[PDB]
Amino acid sequence: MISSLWIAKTGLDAQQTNMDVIANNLANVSTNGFKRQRAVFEDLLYQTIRQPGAQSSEQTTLPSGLQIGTGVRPVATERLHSQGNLSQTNNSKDVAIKGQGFFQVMLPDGTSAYTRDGSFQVDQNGQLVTAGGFQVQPAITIPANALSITIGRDGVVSVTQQGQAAPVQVGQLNLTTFMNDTGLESIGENLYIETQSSGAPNESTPGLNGAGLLYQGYVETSNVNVAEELVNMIQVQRAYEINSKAVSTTDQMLQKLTQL
């Protein structure tokens, strides 16, 4: 009913969105292959009223006329695709990425999703799957009597059987790189899918033209910096305070008009 109240409401909603993003970032600290998110805001419409640059008088113009702005709105939340610090879990099936590539998995629907988390297991049939049971492609089949699984820097998966001095190659782990890495649609479950803003999936060998190197026994932890989150929590709390105070001040003004 009054403009300042709508503007302050938009400010409150934006600050709540910022706090939601902060809480989501802090809730996924222990998640492997997680990237922290940051929201970016834009100011809302600007009421024209007096067009600046108009002729103030026959020989003079109006410098920077009367523009009344509306509130604020969030544009987008961008991920920070940076290499998190590696953690040694001493497991032959945990794989970490040193560069800028992704693992490809197949959803039950038949479509292909992409995940950076490398905590892998083996199913009852022998294929390498993720923690959610999704099959890593290209299919890597581990045979029944395996003694040790070796995954090299270039993505070759080898199995050393009993009594044979040579290792048997059973697959080849490739990495998919996208032109726009932040444009992927996150569906949860540490899974990102291709959108039209994320270019096209370019398959490549882990060590070639820009795919990262695969480390066995390592996991890529989240890149969330927690002290920054605490400081940003302080900032968000204070901003929400100030916006609520603006709402309360507008409430007090309308009261006097009602009393009139």
Partner: protein, 50 residues
């Protein structure tokens, strides 16, 4: 700094385990001593990973 320090802690633990294995096999015919080799895990060149 809690993942770069953990890496150094684990490396020191591995070195100490190797030293203890060398000590325990002081009297073991045909035994060869062992040593550990460590290498840094730099990424960009401004971000060390341990």
């Amino acid at each position: 700094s809690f993942s770069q320090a953990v890496s150094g802690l684990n490396a020191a633990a591995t070195n100490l385990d190797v030293i203890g294995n060398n000590i325990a096999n002081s009297a073991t015919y045909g035994f060869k001593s062992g040593t550990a080799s460590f290498a840094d895990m730099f990424a960009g060149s401004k971000v060390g990973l341990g």
